Design a protein around this ligand. Structure first.
Ligand SMILES: CC(C)(CO)Nc1ncnc2[nH]ccc12
Ligand SMILES: [Cl-]
Length: 167
């Protein structure tokens, strides 16, 4: 039993809700919140910009030190950093950004990072400003993640489409 509330159950291990991931994380304080990161951990917009804003820019400060030490992430890769005031940990995961010409096949590799964590709050990878079809992202999630994932979809219209189109 966990404290996530109001989710629709899609499969044994995948759950979905129309919610603002920032407000969800503040309420639940999950062990792991997933960020829709880029390889530079520049959290300028989309989910990343919203999560970073909610940390009063502390996420960005920590991220800049991480990059200065380690260099950029790989597309499809991840790193674990602090969750600040939102969660114990933040798993920064880089899905492909179609608006950069990145291989959509890397989306499965990106979701594989979730399997290193028993329970996660997450957005759909490569959705929104990363330019992929959120319906496809949900399919890859369900077919790749085996741990317990609570998906937050900001747009109510899109949420209804993902559910009503979910196979
Ligand atoms: C990634 C996508 C398209 C669906 O998960 N968007 C979001 N989902 C949840 N919280 C969010 N906050 C800001 C944007 C956003
Ligand atoms: Cl977005």
């Amino acid at each position: 039993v966990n404290s996530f509330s109001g989710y629709l159950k899609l499969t044994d291990n995948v759950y979905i809700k129309n919610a603002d991931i920032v407000e969800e994380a503040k309420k639940v304080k999950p062990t792991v919140v997933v960020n829709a990161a880029n390889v530079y951990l520049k959290h300028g917009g989309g989910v990343a910009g919203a999560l970073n804003k909610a940390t009063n820019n502390a996420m960005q400060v920590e991220s800049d030190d991480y990059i200065a030490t380690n260099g950029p992430l790989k597309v499809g890769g991840s790193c674990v950093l602090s969750g600040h005031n939102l969660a114990k940990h933040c798993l920064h995961v880089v899905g492909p950004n179609v608006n950069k010409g990145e291989d959509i096949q890397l989306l499965k590799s990106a979701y594989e990072n979730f399997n290193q964590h028993e329970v996660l709050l997450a957005p759909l990878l490569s959705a929104g400003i990363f330019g992929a079809d959120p319906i496809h992202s949900l399919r890859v999630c369900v077919d790749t993640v085996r741990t317990n994932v609570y998906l937050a979809v900001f747009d109510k219209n899109l949420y209804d489409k993902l559910v009503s189109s979910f196979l």
